[PDB]
Amino acid sequence: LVPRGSHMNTSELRICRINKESGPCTGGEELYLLCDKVQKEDISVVFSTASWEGRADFSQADVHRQIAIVFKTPPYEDLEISEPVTVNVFLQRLTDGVCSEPLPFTYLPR
Amino acid sequence: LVPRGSHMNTSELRICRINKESGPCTGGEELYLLCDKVQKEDISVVFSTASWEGRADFSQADVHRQIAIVFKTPPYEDLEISEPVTVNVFLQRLTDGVCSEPLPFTYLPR
Numbered sequence: 728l729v730p731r732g733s734h735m736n737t738s739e740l741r742i743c744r745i746n747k748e749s750g751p752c753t754g755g756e757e758l759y760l761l762c763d764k765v766q767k768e769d770i771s772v773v774f775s776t777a778s779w780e781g782r783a784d785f786s787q788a789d790v791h792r793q794i795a796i797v798f799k800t801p802p803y804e805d806l807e808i809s810e811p812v813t814v815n816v817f818l819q820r821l822t823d824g825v826c827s828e829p830l831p832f833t834y835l836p837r
Numbered sequence: 838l839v840p841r842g843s844h845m846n847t848s849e850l851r852i853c854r855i856n857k858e859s860g861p862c863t864g865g866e867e868l869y870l871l872c873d874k875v876q877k878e879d880i881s882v883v884f885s886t887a888s889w890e891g892r893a894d895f896s897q898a899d900v901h902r903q904i905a906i907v908f909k910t911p912p913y914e915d916l917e918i919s920e921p922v923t924v925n926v927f928l929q930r931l932t933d934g935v936c937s938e939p940l941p942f943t944y945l946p947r
Contacts, residue, residue: 728935731936734929734934734935734936735934735935735936736935736936736937736938737935737936737937739935740928740929740930740935740936740937741928741937741938742926742927742928742937742938742939742940743901743903744856744869744940745926745940745942746854746856748941748942748943749921749923749942749943749944749945750910750942750943750944750945751944751945751947752912752913752915752916752918752922752944752945752946752947753912753913753916753947754909754910754911754912754913755909755910755912756909756910757907757908757909757910758907758908758909758910759854759905759906759907759908760905760906760908760926760940761871761903761904761905762903762904762905762906762928762937763903763904764904765904765906765928765930766930769930769931769932770906770928770929770930770931771928771929771930771931772906772908772926772927772928772929773926773927773928773929773936774910774911774913774924774925774926774942775924775925775927775939776914776922776924776925779913779914779924781911781912781913781914782911783908783909783910783911783926784908784909784911785906785907785908785909789906789907789908790904790905790906791853791904791905791906791907792902792903792904793853793871793872793873793902793903793904793905794871794872794873794874794875794900794901794902794903795869795870795871795872795900795901795903795905796869796870796872796875796880796882796895796899796900796901797867797868797869797895797899797901798867798868798869798870798882798893798894798895798899799864799865799866799867799868799893799894799895800860800864800865800866800867800868800884800893801864801884801891801892801893801894802862802863802864802865802891803862803863803864803884803889803891804886804889804891805862806862806863808862811859812862812886813859814884814885814886814889815884815885815886816852816855816870816882816883816884816893817852817882817883817885818850818851818852818872818875818880818881818882818883819844819850819880819881819882819883820850820875820876820879820880820881821879821880821881822879824844824845825838825844825845825846825847825849825850826841826844826845826846826847826850826883827846827847827850827851827852827872828846828851828852829852829885830852830854830855830870831858832855832858832859832860832884833858833859833860834859834860834861834862835859835860835861835862836862837861837862837863
């Protein structure tokens with residue numbers, strides 16, 4: 728437990744990433760972050776600067792145990808597309824080839 | 838197990854979201870997705886269209902068990918900022934007030 732300003736930091740609590748790295752100063756924006764183990768009934772998200780502090784709003788129901796898969800995308804068939812093209816992205820199990828419902832993803836021209 | 842083209846889909850496999858909804862048709866882009874339970878040794882990510890298919894590249898080491906927190910951002914102190922301002926975002930446990938290392942987030946003007 729190392730000191731950090733007016734509070735203590737621990738290696739036990741860790742944020743891996745935030746889906747977006749920026750947003751409107753107006754707030755009320757819905758984002759999501761990935762983190763190591765936390766207790767949904769005893770956690771919070773804080774935004775701060777040396778002299779300012781604001782808390783994010785969420786409920787226990789917004790804390791989900793999920794699996795995150797980091798991956799590199801395959802290139803699209805045609806690298807010369809002049810317009811955006813949105814394909815399907817889905818999971819597929821190797822053993823029985825069963826898949827998941829797809830989610831859209833759009834390839835952008837060069 | 839419902840038919841879907843040349844394969845079968847299941848409610849057992851589910852993608853919740855992809856961090857980015859678009860990217861260069863050139864591929865080789867590093868993205869990450871959230872999904873329900875999968876077996877790291879028996880899963881894959883596919884991008885496709887009716888007549889095209891490409892697989893994403895990742896290893897078992899890229900499949901992580903994580904906790905995802907959905908939340909709404911607090912507004913920034915000053916809604917009149919003319920330039921970008923990047924603050925700190927971190928987790929904080931309510932019981933003992935212990936925090937996590939911060940991650941940057943930048944508020945953008947209106």
